[model samples]
Target: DCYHGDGQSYRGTSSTTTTGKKCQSWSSMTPHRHQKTPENYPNAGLTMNYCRNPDADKGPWCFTTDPSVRWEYCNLKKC
Candidate 1:
């Protein structure tokens, strides 16, 4: 049987570019908000996952919550 917890996974190695700049962090890549399909990515429009980034604590970043609010489609959907 497969054991499932809070959908949390251990962080792998940090990603870096040729310049050695950290591309992405483990926690930074964790999904914040998870929604069901059709509801998450409605109409198959271009949308953004609001909680899929690592800049929320700082300020507003490009993460789509409601397409209507940004006049853009949120690209989140259920698996």
Candidate 2:
């Protein structure tokens, strides 16, 4: 299971690491119709809205099934 820093746990695969950071498994990502890539992330194609900031002032973050595409705006450390 991938454990988010916010104390949320999702049933998914992940790398075993002693490091504090946890990365979500690509296979476990669910597609969302509203998820999209920003202009800076031109080639991201389709992305999934996996996590959003609990603070109303901050924006949401996303990821893609395509490993080649980088999630420039996603702050995985907070996941």
Candidate 3:
């Protein structure tokens, strides 16, 4: 999916990471324990395993399903 700016407003549903890692749900902290969650960042969507920029970082990123990998940025292009 394409996005503009830093992708803070990006609501696309691309949940997989750039490396083909499955994204962990914001509701779950098993794979990666973090605070960037739905309850804390409701405005950022934080829906299921969908990638989102809750901290307004470089782009859309999410916790990974793999226990070894904490998080990663999604494969998105600038619009």
TM-scores, all candidates, are 0.16, 0.22, 0.93
What TM-score would you give candidate 2 relative to the actual structure?
0.22
The best candidate in terms of TM-score: 3
- Candidate 3: regions farther than 4 A off: none
Candidate 3 differs from the real structure by a C-alpha RMSD in angstroms, to one decimal, of 0.9
lDDT of 1 at 21: 30
Off by over 4 Å in 2: 1-51, 54-58, 72-79
Name the better of 1 and 2 by TM-score: 2
lDDT of each: 0.25, 0.33, 0.87
> Candidate 3, overall lDDT?
0.87
After superposition, the stretches of candidate 1 with alpha carbons farther than 4 Å from their true spots are: 1-14, 26-79
Q: For model 3, where is the 10-residue window of minimal lDDT?
A: 29-38
Any residue pairs clashing in model 2, and if so which? 4-79, 5-79
Q: Tell me the tens digit of each residue's lDDT in model 1 across 1-79.
A: 1111221221223223223232221222233232323344343221232222222122112222232332121122212
